[PDB]
Amino acid sequence: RPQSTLRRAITAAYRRPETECLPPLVEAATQSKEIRDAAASTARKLIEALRGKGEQFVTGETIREALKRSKELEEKGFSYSYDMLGEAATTAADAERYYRDYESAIHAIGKASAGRGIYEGPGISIKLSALHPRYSRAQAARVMGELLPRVKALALLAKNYDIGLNIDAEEADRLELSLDLLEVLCLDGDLSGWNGMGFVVQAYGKRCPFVLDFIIDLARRSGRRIMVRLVKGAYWDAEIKRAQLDGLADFPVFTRKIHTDVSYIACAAKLLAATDVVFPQFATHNAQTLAAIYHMAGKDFHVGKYEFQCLHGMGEPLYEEVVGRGKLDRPCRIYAPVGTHETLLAYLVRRLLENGANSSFVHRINDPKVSIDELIADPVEVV
Amino acid sequence: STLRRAITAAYRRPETECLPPLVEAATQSKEIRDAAASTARKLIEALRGKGEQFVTGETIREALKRSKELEEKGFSYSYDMLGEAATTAADAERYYRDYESAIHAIGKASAGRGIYEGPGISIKLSALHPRYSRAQAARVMGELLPRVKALALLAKNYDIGLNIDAEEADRLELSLDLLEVLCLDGDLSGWNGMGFVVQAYGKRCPFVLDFIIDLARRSGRRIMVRLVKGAYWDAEIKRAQLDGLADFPVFTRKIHTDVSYIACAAKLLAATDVVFPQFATHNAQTLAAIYHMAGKDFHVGKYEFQCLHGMGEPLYEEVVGRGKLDRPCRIYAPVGTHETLLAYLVRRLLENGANSSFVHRINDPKVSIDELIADPVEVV
């Protein structure tokens, strides 16, 4: 079977015991004392800068409005990825509506990009659940045969304007389908010459390093430089609840928060060693995570090597201390939702759980009981 | 029983079938409609001149100290030690200890004020059993019953209210069976503090109320009944869609929940001899309707309003006190850390951010006062 070894490794990791997943990640995430000392200084600076000085999550109601509101931050060195809000389509008519939303957005974003390309100019992010009715329930063969022509058509428009098109990561049980779709698109000759295809991998998932191995190898055999957004993950609370009801003895996600942090750093090390064939995009609002990757990546940098990413309404204060020659001189792409209350609910719940959780960096930075010492501590050394 | 059969039969009764009996009961006379429109306009005009926000204190001692100001203004309290959906035996044990310690503190603070003038407590059954939603009902009740009875006995000892909050629709039957056992338990005789929430967004609501009113009358317990719309609507919809069902256990149009609430309020106001109705709402039109439906006769203990801490103060400052409507309001007061706050806080966000919610529409420039005072019966 093609890629038998890489695919078997993903499947074997799906619900592997958490204690067995961690040792290789801890080793891969271990950095030198010299690097850890330098990163602690950077993280302290970022946090000292930070601790001083629903509509909040949405950039605009239409793509035209969102694009207009993006000019100020683009002038400062930020880029954008626009998300037409909407997911989990329940009818064919809803899936067709979302498809048309994305199509119209690509034309508008492509015009605004004006030839800036996939790294300096804006792109789009899509959710597969918006494009197939009952995405979570229908057999993969039926989902594939109807979804693939739709995603290909959107990818062709993005190619035509030379903008990025990212497939967002959703629930753990749709990782396999989405990855199979990524493979088919990356091997499709009609998309040749365009490196804008992107894909998210969630470091809270046990399969993350093995999915990355598959994607890096896919980049090598397809000739596409795949954009890879490394995230921790947005669905943790729902995944725990679903696994409990499913009767599982071992879950598809980690259950200790610092294990996700270690997983993220280990996976960043793998991505940073493969920048010839992937474009790593480090999505995080955690200043300690950011500092660790900034130092892991070393002194040599150019635009197009890698970037950081943040969510609209959450990451701007931190990344104002990152973008720009006087700061860390590293770019950041803002994930920019577009829509109204009618399409905001699912995304907003995930933001509430992210912002309100006692374990989240964005909560802890405002917690008087959490010292700066603890905020800059390297989680890898805790394990 | 016949009353319990009506509850089970209504579980997923088609929505269009549920409405005609509610529309009739929620229909008010023109004089009452006109008075309610006048009161509601006055309340809304005062309003339009106006997660730490949702927590009264980290501990029960802190929350009690902060309650003195509003208690002398005419408010009362129901304290909620945050916590729900226990996943382990250790978690359910910890929540039990929190509820137990809260009852001792609240009961000592009550100092003989009784169940209407003095503070009470609210509990969630899902906090007290480690597999509350995922285990067999008869077994869940058989382990939950001694725990809830022990808490009820403490509440009786101090003569305070103890309310069972309502949670997911698939747990209504279990919790109702628990209420019946407690109300027939001779060890709790002479105490009228047992309370129970019924959710008007549920199709079973009027039949649950019939069962509870009859249970109160035959048991001699003046059951405190908190009538709410409901806090879990988005979750019930998502579960019912995944379940492949065509008919859900909740209404799908917000106006139907509003009509259901008014119809159920009418049923409760006709039964104040045997139940203590507690009208929990932040909607000034809903409040004004119930205020006039209740009539001119009032005494402390007949009924009360209720609100959530951090949400209801602007409205109820126009209600409590002799310069206002002279009706009491009990504040639901969450107590706990940010850790235990998360699920409650999310529900507060689905409630406050929803375009259909009164608390959002009150600030929405596109929504007229004329629309806010519309009578749901006349709009459905």
Ligand SMILES: Cc1cc2nc3c(=O)[nH]c(=O)nc-3n(C[C@H](O)[C@H](O)[C@H](O)COP(=O)(O)OP(=O)(O)OC[C@H]3O[C@@H](n4cnc5c(N)ncnc54)[C@H](O)[C@@H]3O)c2cc1C
């Ligand atoms: C631009 C951008 C795009 C994103 N796209 C996606 C996407 O397509 N799909 C997606 O799923 N996520 C996505 N995310 C990630 C998600 O939305 C959160 O923003 C992210 O997980 C928060 O991580 P952090 O490093 O900012 O914060 P931190 O506070 O460091 O980490 C918080 C994270 O830890 C994890 N976590 C919390 N508790 C536990 C626990 N007990 N055990 C194990 N893990 C735990 C969760 O992943 C949580 O979000 C994206 C994030 C950004 C910034």
Ligand SMILES: Cc1cc2nc3c(=O)[nH]c(=O)nc-3n(C[C@H](O)[C@H](O)[C@H](O)COP(=O)(O)OP(=O)(O)OC[C@H]3O[C@@H](n4cnc5c(N)ncnc54)[C@H](O)[C@@H]3O)c2cc1C
């Ligand atoms: C003191 C207090 C205690 C409470 N205790 C509980 C409890 O134990 N259990 C519980 O479940 N709830 C409880 N609630 C209710 C819940 O938390 C909300 O506060 C309440 O439902 C809001 O109703 P309202 O009259 O203030 O607002 P409104 O804006 O008038 O009504 C909003 C409500 O309408 C309903 N709704 C919204 N959209 C739709 C729709 N499309 N179709 C059908 N219905 C819809 C929902 O129930 C929503 O909450 C309590 C409320 C208070 C004030």
